[PDB]
Amino acid sequence: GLMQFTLPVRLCKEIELFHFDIGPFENMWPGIFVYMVHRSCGTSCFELEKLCRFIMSVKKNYRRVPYHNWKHAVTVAHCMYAILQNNHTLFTDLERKGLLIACLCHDLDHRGFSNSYLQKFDHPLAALYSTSTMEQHHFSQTVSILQLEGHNIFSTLSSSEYEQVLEIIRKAIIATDLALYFGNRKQLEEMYQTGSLNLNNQSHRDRVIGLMMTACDLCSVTKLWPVTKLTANDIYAEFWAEGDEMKKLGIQPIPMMDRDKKDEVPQGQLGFYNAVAIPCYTTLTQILPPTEPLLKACRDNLSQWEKVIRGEE
Numbered sequence: 001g002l003m004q005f006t007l008p009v010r011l012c013k014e015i016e017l018f019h020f021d022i023g024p025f026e027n028m029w030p031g032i033f034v035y036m037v038h039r040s041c042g043t044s045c046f047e048l049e050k051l052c053r054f055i056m057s058v059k060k061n062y063r064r065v066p067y068h069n070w071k072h073a074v075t076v077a078h079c080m081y082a083i084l085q086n087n088h089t090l091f092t093d094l095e096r097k098g099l100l101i102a103c104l105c106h107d108l109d110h111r112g113f114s115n116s117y118l119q120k121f122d123h124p125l126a127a128l129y130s131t132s133t134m135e136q137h138h139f140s141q142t143v144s145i146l147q148l149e150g151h152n153i154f155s156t157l158s159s160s161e162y163e164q165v166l167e168i169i170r171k172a173i174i175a176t177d178l179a180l181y182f183g184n185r186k187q188l189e190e191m192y193q194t195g196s197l198n199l200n201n202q203s204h205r206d207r208v209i210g211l212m213m214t215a216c217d218l219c220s221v222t223k224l225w226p227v228t229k230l231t232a233n234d235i236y237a238e239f240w241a242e243g244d245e246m247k248k249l250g251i252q253p254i255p256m257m258d259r260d261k262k263d264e265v266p267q268g269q270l271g272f273y274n275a276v277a278i279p280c281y282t283t284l285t286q287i288l289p290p291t292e293p294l295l296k297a298c299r300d301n302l303s304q305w306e307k308v309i310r311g312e313e
């Protein structure tokens with residue numbers, strides 16, 4: 001029980017900050033996650049032998065795609081770590097256990113393609129899950145990996161505690177379906193404005209947890225500009241590959257995914273910051289004031305993209 005993971009001094013300090021980048025050393029990411037689980041939850045909440053075997057199986061089931069890869073998984077878990085650590089008293093023991101695992105697992109077996117491409121291609125997953133197609137798949141993979149021998153990190157929970165944490169993880173992963181974000185944030189905005197938002201209402205907590213998941217998932221837009229700018233290339237490498245696969249089905253893709261419309265990317269990032277990212281972090285800051293650094297960093301990057309359009313970079 002007395003085996004703490006310890007990071008070098010720079011990582012030890014910077015990991016606490018929202019804008020931390022986990023770096024290019026793949027073989028440190030597992031240690032970074034255990035470090036975060038230990039400080040966020042405790043050295044007791046998981047058996048190290050079981051947790052380690054879980055992490056390496058989750059890693060194994062993330063594919064070698066430009067963006068929706070193992071680094072994204074650990075990056076998204078890190079943002080959730082920063083929210084939980086800056087909102088210490090707001091979250092139950094089970095929520096802190098569930099949400100870090102939810103984030104690591106949230107894009108399991110992603111192929112780099114949108115729900116929309118699966119439906120137009122007529123992928124079997126689109127027949128199995130008619131909405132939130134990949135997100136239902138991501139949760140399915142999480143449960144399958146949990147059920148490998150020696151992988152059940154929750155085995156010391158009671159039957160109802162166990163059912164609760166898997167329900168937290170299912171809702172958390174489903175929430176990362178950006179199609180569901182818009183309505184979720186609109187409702188949270190209304191509940192915040194009318195003052196009907198009550199964190200003792202479970203259906204309200206679910207909504208707040210969904211928004212935290214959108215916030216952690218989109219967190220590449222809350223990094224220092226060089227990280228944000230370099231991550232955008234990975235994001236657009238997948239979009240443009242999807243664009244290519246659409247043209248192969250005889251469909252003109254939306255411009256975001258057309259590599260011929262590469263010039264339009266700076267304006268499309270403005271739309272994304274204005275339509276999705278800024279509203280997300282605004283409502284999260286209203287509900288959880290200590291996540292304001294995510295909004296401030298997001299606004300700085302909007303400004304950086306405006307400077308790109310105005311020819312200044």
Ligand SMILES: O=c1ccn(-c2cccc(OC(F)(F)F)c2)nc1-c1ccnn1-c1cccc(F)c1
Pocket residue numbers: 178179217218219220221235256268269272275276
């Ligand atoms: O930079 C971006 C530009 C456009 N979209 C996007 C994604 C998906 C639907 C979309 O259209 C909308 F607005 F109508 F929903 C836009 N997302 C990002 C972005 C930034 C950080 N993470 N992601 C992201 C990427 C892939 C997938 C993903 F889930 C997030």
Ligand SMILES: [Cl-]
Pocket residue numbers: 039
């Ligand atoms: Cl602490």
Ligand SMILES: [Mg+2]
Pocket residue numbers: 106107134176177
């Ligand atoms: Mg996803």
Ligand SMILES: [Zn+2]
Pocket residue numbers: 072076106107176217
């Ligand atoms: Zn994701």
